[PDB]
Amino acid sequence: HCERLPYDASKWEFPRDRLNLGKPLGRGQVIEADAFGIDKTATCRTVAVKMLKEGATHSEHRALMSELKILIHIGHHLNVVNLLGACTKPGGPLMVIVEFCKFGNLSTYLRSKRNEFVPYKDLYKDFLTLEHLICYSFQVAKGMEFLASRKCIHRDLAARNILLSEKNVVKICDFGLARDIPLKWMAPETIFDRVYTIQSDVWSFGVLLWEIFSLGASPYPGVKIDEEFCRRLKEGTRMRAPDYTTPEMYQTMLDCWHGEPSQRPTFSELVEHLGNLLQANA
Numbered sequence: 001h002c003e004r005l006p007y008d009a010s011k012w013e014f015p016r017d018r019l020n021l022g023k024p025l026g027r028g029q030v031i032e033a034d035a036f037g038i039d040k041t042a043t044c045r046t047v048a049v050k051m052l053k054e055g056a057t058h059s060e061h062r063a064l065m066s067e068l069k070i071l072i073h074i075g076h077h078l079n080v081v082n083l084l085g086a087c088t089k090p091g092g093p094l095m096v097i098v099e100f101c102k103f104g105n106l107s108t109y110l111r112s113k114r115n116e117f118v119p120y121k122d123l124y125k126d127f128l129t130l131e132h133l134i135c136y137s138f139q140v141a142k143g144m145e146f147l148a149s150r151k152c153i154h155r156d157l158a159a160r161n162i163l164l165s166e167k168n169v170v171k172i173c174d175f176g177l178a179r180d181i182p183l184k185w186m187a188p189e190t191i192f193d194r195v196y197t198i199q200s201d202v203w204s205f206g207v208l209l210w211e212i213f214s215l216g217a218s219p220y221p222g223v224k225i226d227e228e229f230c231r232r233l234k235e236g237t238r239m240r241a242p243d244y245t246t247p248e249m250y251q252t253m254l255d256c257w258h259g260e261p262s263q264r265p266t267f268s269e270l271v272e273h274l275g276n277l278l279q280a281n282a
């Protein structure tokens with residue numbers, strides 16, 4: 001019921017003749033673009049634009065319109081990919097304009113920096129450290145506490161859906177399955193009972209932490225995702241600690257993977273706790 005939602009064109013509508021489309025960013029289609037005056041200043045800024053494919057079904061146009069209204073409803077936060085404007089009027093294609101994250105998804109970035117990482121550390125001069133990793137974790141937690149306060153469940157929280165921007169700002173994206181009230185990231189109650197709550201997102205956040213402190217490895221390495229895996233997960237079997245974690249961060253993963261959803265930390269508690277780890281590293 002996010003079709004009903006209002007669209008204030010005065011606030012959001014951006015003229016199509018001030019958008020210059022660039023290279024595709026993959027796969028609905030996302031394209032890199034240049035927008036003049038989208039923050040109301042006299043500047044040409046790089047943005048990302050979701051538009052439709054050459055087919056134009058009603059359900060596809062409905063879906064994208066729903067994405068837009070959900071983003072308007074959610075509101076702005078530093079640690080989500082924010083809406084800048086949209087092109088919705090009868091002139092041309094439906095286009096949703098968001099902030100461009102120039103480094104792409106966090107899983108891929110982290111993988112590309114495995115020989116450019118050192119923990120806690122004589123002027124290497126470009127490398128990732130534990131500080132960065134804990135900083136990214138803290139930021140996603142902040143983004144999730146925000147989404148939780150807007151009464152959303154993400155339902156697909158994974159490093160590939162975290163985007164990296166300039167100045168080490170990470171942003172939660174993919175709100176196409178965000179609701180109001182892939183198995184290796186899924187909580188047991190969501191696997192077995194089909195449940196989704198903010199506390200199920202906490203479990204996924206735990207898998208995301210494992211992804212961060214493995215530098216973008218795939219969860220449950222070499223494990224068959226079958227009826228046994230789900231047995232083991234129900235029982236209480238968990239991933240071992242990844243290669244680049246601290247003890248404290250692995251403990252937080254285990255906490256997020258509590259069997260009882262109400263016994264997992266809330267995102268506010270994770271923001272508190274991760275904030276303390278960040279300052280302890282520093």
Ligand SMILES: COc1cc(Nc2nccc(N(C)c3ccc4c(C)n[nH]c4c3)n2)cc(OC)c1OC
Nearest residue numbers: 025030048049050096098099100101102103104105
């Ligand atoms: C993941 O691929 C890259 C992304 C990006 N950067 C980027 N920044 C912001 C958004 C965004 N995306 C994909 C997007 C935008 C709008 C929507 C909407 C309405 N729904 N979903 C959206 C998804 N992609 C940069 C890359 O290399 C530099 C990538 O590697 C090719």
